[PDB]
Amino acid sequence: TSIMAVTFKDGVILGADSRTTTGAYIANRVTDKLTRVHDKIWCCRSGSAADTQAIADIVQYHLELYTSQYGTPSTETAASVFKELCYENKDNLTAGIIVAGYDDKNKGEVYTIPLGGSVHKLPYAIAGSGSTFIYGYCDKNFRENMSKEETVDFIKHSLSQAIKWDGSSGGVIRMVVLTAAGVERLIFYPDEYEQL
Amino acid sequence: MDIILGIRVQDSVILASSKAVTRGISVLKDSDDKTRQLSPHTLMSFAGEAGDTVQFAEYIQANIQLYSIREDYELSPQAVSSFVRQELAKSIRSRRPYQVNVLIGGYDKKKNKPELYQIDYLGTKVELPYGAHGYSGFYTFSLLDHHYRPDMTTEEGLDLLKLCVQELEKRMPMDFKGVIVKIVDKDGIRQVDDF
């Protein structure tokens, strides 16, 4: 799995591959790892599919109930709910989640939640087995306050390499753009990103 | 503990049980009675893990004695054996199971028939003409298969039992220090003091 979230001038973009594996068999080649916990708060999932689905379902429930009582939650609040589940159930969970969202006050924010259940707010984040191969590339090529088109190219190129080297990563590159304008879904097929 | 035997003849049930108690390297006692009277016409012998055996036997004894007082009536051997089996069948799926095997010898005063039941620690019940627990049956069942009849007298049953004990004393490695023999018939329970 190769997943990443990147903040930019107008907001934040989430990116992911579409491969799900059982050992070396690809159980699903068109998986959607970019999942919605609120209108403009999404997450990237890595690790156990069952665990991350169960967690995301619970978080969506908590934020739906939060919204009914207290209005729209912050991205920090969403990350806290993820953390509370991941930290308190660390013995029984295998979930690596990246939380990303857009406020009008705080703009684009990214929080990463690794295995332990710790929280780390970052300008951008990478995770999944395929992330290991792009630590160098992403550190060298990331800039703050990029444009939408520049950020899409950054994610596309980064995940392209992650897919190239990681057997557990592959398929299409899905992306979700989060701005004041709304929510845009993007997709990029092998013929496009392999030749980069 | 080690060896417990049972044989049902014409008009009685005979139970034989070893006297030795061995805790590791030493034989701590050579006169131990591995049996409890459940009711006037029902006797239960037992063998298994240390502590559990006596604890289980006395627990069963107490329950049957309670039933006898409450109803002013003696339960049939078949009824007592079923109660015992259920307790062991319950026990096997517990946190810490009773590691006890038993023989139940009784005389049914209603049907005027002796009855012998063999029950293991899992709760496996069988009615038999003759039975045993542990390694005892491996030696004794061949002799009993040959010599046994349904119409044997009590004296003939004791002679056939002597032949079983003699074989055990010859071929078993452990010294079980002889057996205490008890007879169950229409007149109740009595011990054969010379064997």
């Binding site: 159980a27 068109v30 998986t31 959607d32 156990s48 069952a50 689905q53 | -």
Partner: protein, 226 residues
Amino acid sequence: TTIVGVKFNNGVVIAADTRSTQGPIVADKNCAKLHRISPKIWCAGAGTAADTEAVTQLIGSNIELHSLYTSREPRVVSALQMLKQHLFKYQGHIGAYLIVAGVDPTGSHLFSIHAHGSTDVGYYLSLGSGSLAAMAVLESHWKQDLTKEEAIKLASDAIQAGIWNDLGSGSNVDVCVMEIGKDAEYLRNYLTPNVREEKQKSYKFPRGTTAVLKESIVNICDIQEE
């Protein structure tokens, strides 16, 4: 086992083989792996047979009660959600691997469920020991905008691939078609390509061949009058 699911123009079709096994032994040659959750929601199960049956009946029971409570026809996502939350709770110890399909007021749907509680969405899916043989066929012949007749053909061909090439699968092909605005048609033994040939000999014995010790009438009737 080989089970598949295929989406088409106006609905969804699922299919399965009919072999049940105990290690290398065939326990049942004509097993029914296509279960009904509700009238228009059917699922196919692989893995532990008792688990797939039990979990299907439980959710199917609760779905019926839910449908009565809400005065609405049941939805596939409801069956999906209830199944995955049940299976997740038991941490994979309930060995049920399902393909859930159906039609409802929202439209036609097709999902898979893994024993640990993960779900997946697709136009074509396969589960079981023969899933690789079946998926090879699906990946070779599947296209967008399939007709009902094309989807049934593709589904049964995918099951056949499992029947012939996978030792865990065999015997017959069961199918269930769930079209929008129609009753679901359950096609038990849609294909029968494995009939046993006539035996060379009859093994009917002469009467009295077996040695008998005792005979007796068994009283099955109740206690009689008079």
